[PDB]
Amino acid sequence: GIKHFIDLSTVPATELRAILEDAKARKARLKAGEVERPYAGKVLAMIFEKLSTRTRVSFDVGMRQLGGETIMLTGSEMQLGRSETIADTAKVLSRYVDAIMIRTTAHERMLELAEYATVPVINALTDDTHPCQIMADVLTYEEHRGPIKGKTFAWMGDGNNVLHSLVEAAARFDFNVNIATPKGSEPKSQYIDWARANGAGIMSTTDPEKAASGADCIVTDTWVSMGQEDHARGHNVFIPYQVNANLMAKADPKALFMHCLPAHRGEEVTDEVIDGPQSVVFDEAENRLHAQKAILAWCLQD
Amino acid sequence: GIKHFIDLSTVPATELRAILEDAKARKARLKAGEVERPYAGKVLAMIFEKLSTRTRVSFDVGMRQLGGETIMLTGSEMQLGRSETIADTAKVLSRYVDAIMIRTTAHERMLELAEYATVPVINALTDDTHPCQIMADVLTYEEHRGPIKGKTFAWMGDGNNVLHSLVEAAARFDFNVNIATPKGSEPKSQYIDWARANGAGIMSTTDPEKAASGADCIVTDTWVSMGQEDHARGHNVFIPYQVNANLMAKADPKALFMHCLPAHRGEEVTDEVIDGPQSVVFDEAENRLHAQKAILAWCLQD
Amino acid sequence: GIKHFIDLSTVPATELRAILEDAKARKARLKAGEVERPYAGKVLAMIFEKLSTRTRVSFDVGMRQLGGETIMLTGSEMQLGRSETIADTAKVLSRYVDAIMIRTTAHERMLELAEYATVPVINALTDDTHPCQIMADVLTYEEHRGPIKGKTFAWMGDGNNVLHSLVEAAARFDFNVNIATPKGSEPKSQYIDWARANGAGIMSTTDPEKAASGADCIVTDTWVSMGQEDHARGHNVFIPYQVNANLMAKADPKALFMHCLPAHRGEEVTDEVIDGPQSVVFDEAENRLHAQKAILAWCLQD
Ligand SMILES: [Cl-]
Ligand SMILES: [Cl-]
Ligand SMILES: [Cl-]
């Protein structure tokens, strides 16, 4: 019964839609100057096994705007499994707080925390998925362009946590994703396979122009995040996938550009695109706050 | 005049009882859904010279439920005596906050902080005593079993901060403690000596069965916490003191099992005891929050 | 238009005066027992590239007393320029919070943050200036002695961030500073030059008695803070500049003694001065809270 928020593929489509609509409603009240406290007396534990300041700040502010409290815990203050079983940690933290946000590396420790917690566990992000970023992205898209149904997003470069959640979102929100990767039409991806089985249109190609053509949103991420630790090697395999003005001109004229920050200008995207009129990267970043507020509210309800 | 909370042996019995009764009253209001703010505008500084996340979380949530504020400070942000005299630190922090919680190693730096502070200083725990854990334990006992007066607790293994405060509590709350330790009837303990002089019945033995027989509560802690840094050596001196089903069967049929977490199943206690029907370890953990709220309220009053 | 608080030399005199008067007004309401929340829903990010616990605590409590929220970020959580451009950090943090306090080493990264932020940036302190400490000092002076106009402060030892802001304050609040330094009447200081051009009377001398004579406030700081990393060398160049009873007796009979903590008794000041009846060091420390509240309120207004 507990309303965990683990991944887009573990929450029903109708509920994800309800969360998005609530995010818009709460954002409207906030921008109108309303300060409210529906979750006064609720506490969110925030466990960070790896550093993510933008995730910390966006969840912290969001919880406070709901009237709740937050407690920031590091890996050094808390590594699940170090000093006691994860079950014991989960059961004790459940006696003190009302929800637990976790940023972990591997998925398994988050799932074990959720198994034994009696309060909701929220995936702030992991190495393999990033549902909260993608909720922020879908929110941003709809704010700028209207209903996302049937639209096409084109991802440039190779997979990472954000792309994995994006293809899950294509299923849950009934849109399409074109993916231009050196891996070609043979990506071998559990996420793509799940998305296709659950309503997404996914096309995989080596060719950026083929993916971008007529697309409604062009998305990329850093060379490091996409699996190239080496700068020159990164430059090498990813330079053909760069989001530049020439690539954006192949997309729909009203296309948006998105990027889960941080970005490196001149690498995966040029200055003129990310700081140009099609970019929504800062609105996207703001929407981490507004989307995550609605996820928190959904988890805390009842 | 300042209401420091240093140790059970430094607060009068009647006041400790008042604190316990207030803990029950406030807990009842909380469970009934009331959110209140009697100490709005009060700030608790929390100084941790050594890591204790369960102590941090339980004090933080408790202070917030009183309507107050908390500030988390580490040893690296604050080691008493490093960059200025402790007197200077105490006097300045007293100008900013309304109470100071400290987790220190040795007692002396806590006492010097209290000497110079003009706000209450609270012993969150030290290497030598743990009054807040024992207030939580007495609360838990009475919630499950009624008045603690005249009851008998049996501790298995050797001394540590928790046992030291437990024997002080035996005096202050008029109960008995049987202690089964390799040290035998010759423990040589300042705490036992003080407790006996102040109303406690204390019996020390090498024999776990003698200590446990007919007892109302069986308590233990980790081999490391009880002075054995080596695992095999720990196993070696402490395995006869393990709390297992055979030992629990020697106690009163209504006996409780307690353990200041974290615990190591298969070492000082077996799975079947700590996860069985006599165990109250998670309620005990929850009661850190409720007991410490009442200590904070007592310190902050007037 | 954005109300950054960078330095005393970047804010108009009339506004600095307004801030001081508001600090007194808000302090009076607080001491009278009023708990108010004019900036409910406002969030202050606190970026510390170098440790300063007294700065953290004083800003945190102050923001909370205004009804706002704070988020503590370290250098390791945030070093401006490490993982993305400072512009990108500024623009994203501006979407989440309402003001940004920064403690940096060098001024330049604070100024770039302020260039790109769309919320006020506040200089908590830097290696080169300390406007908030000096606002606290001027507040303290006026509370104990009345209007500061035309008074004379005497600084003993060599320059540092505090002295730099003090000489700026001499201009902005129309008072005088005598500076006794081994550098003599040839200090070569951009701050002195600016202050003189903007209304301050500044006299520089090697002779402590000449600086102290008839002064209304005697101020010093640690040997390390004044540029002597070596203790024996420090003792060596600075011992003639020590603030002791003999030096205080040369000042006006009603002179105050000030020191931005921490202090080292027996080095730059003796016990009998800092713990004696002319010392206001603890009131000065308290006034970090009250002065910084008024700076926050000024930045957050409108
Ligand atoms: Cl992120
Ligand atoms: Cl503990
Ligand atoms: Cl400072």
Side-chain angles (χ1 to χ4, degrees), chain A residues 52 54-55 125 130 133 260-261 288:
Chain A
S52 182
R54 67 185 69 250
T55 300
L125 66 151
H130 203 339
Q133 177 66 51
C260 184
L261 311 181
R288 295 284 291 276

Side-chain angles (χ1 to χ4, degrees), chain A residues 37 40-41 43 69-74 76-78 82-85 87-88 91-93 95-97, chain B residues 35 37 51 53-54 56-58 60-61 64-65 72 261-265 275 282-283 285-286 288-289:
Chain A
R37 306 178 51 80
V43 181
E69 312 291 349
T70 67
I71 301 176
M72 174 60 191
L73 304 161
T74 69
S76 91
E77 292 180 291
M78 173 59 70
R82 182 168 53 192
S83 295
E84 67 189 348
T85 61
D88 286 352
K91 291 156 68 171
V92 172
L93 193 45
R95 297 306 185 101
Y96 298 148
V97 305
Chain B
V35 173
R37 306 178 51 80
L51 179 68
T53 300
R54 67 185 69 250
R56 181 190 164 190
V57 175
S58 58
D60 196 4
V61 172
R64 297 189 205 211
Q65 288 180 351
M72 174 60 191
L261 311 181
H264 300 303
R265 283 167 185 75
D275 293 335
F282 297 106
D283 281 355
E286 183 180 331
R288 295 284 291 276
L289 163 61

Side-chain angles (χ1 to χ4, degrees), chain B residues 52 54-55 124-125 130 133 260-262 288:
Chain B
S52 182
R54 67 185 69 250
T55 300
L125 66 151
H130 203 339
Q133 177 66 51
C260 184
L261 311 181
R288 295 284 291 276

Side-chain angles (χ1 to χ4, degrees), chain C residues 26-78 80-107 109-185 187 189-208 210-228 230 232 234:
Chain C
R26 295 183 186 281
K27 183 178 180 178
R29 296 198 302 271
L30 184 79
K31 297 276 188 194
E34 306 179 21
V35 173
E36 57 187 68
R37 306 178 51 80
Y39 294 104
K42 300 289 176 166
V43 181
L44 177 71
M46 307 184 302
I47 301 171
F48 283 88
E49 301 198 308
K50 188 190 207 173
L51 179 68
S52 182
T53 300
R54 67 185 69 250
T55 300
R56 181 190 164 190
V57 175
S58 58
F59 265 101
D60 196 4
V61 172
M63 185 65 173
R64 297 189 205 211
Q65 288 180 351
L66 293 174
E69 312 291 349
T70 67
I71 301 176
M72 174 60 191
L73 304 161
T74 69
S76 91
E77 292 180 291
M78 173 59 70
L80 300 178
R82 182 168 53 192
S83 295
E84 67 189 348
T85 61
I86 296 182
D88 286 352
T89 299
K91 291 156 68 171
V92 172
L93 193 45
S94 295
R95 297 306 185 101
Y96 298 148
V97 305
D98 304 282
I100 303 163
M101 183 229 70
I102 184 161
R103 193 302 188 220
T104 194
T105 64
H107 255 66
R109 280 191 299 163
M110 172 180 58
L111 299 170
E112 200 172 0
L113 186 71
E115 181 168 345
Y116 296 106
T118 53
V119 300
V121 170
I122 297 164
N123 178 2
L125 66 151
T126 70
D127 293 346
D128 297 311
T129 63
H130 203 339
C132 291
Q133 177 66 51
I134 296 302
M135 290 293 277
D137 289 351
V138 172
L139 179 57
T140 303
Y141 186 85
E142 293 203 334
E143 287 180 327
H144 282 256
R145 292 285 177 268
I148 196 163
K149 177 181 176 142
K151 297 296 181 195
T152 297
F153 277 49
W155 178 274
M156 307 292 142
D158 213 323
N160 70 11
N161 55 0
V162 179
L163 175 60
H164 298 158
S165 289
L166 179 63
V167 304
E168 296 190 343
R172 290 298 197 220
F173 295 101
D174 302 291
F175 67 92
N176 307 293
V177 181
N178 293 343
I179 308 170
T181 166
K183 294 204 165 59
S185 61
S189 163
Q190 69 190 76
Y191 307 99
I192 293 175
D193 294 349
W194 182 91
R196 282 196 177 122
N198 289 274
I202 308 293
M203 188 277 289
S204 297
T205 177
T206 58
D207 187 355
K210 180 181 173 176
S213 175
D216 299 296
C217 187
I218 299 303
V219 194
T220 197
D221 206 337
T222 66
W223 295 344
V224 173
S225 80
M226 297 187 307
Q228 296 293 303
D230 198 71

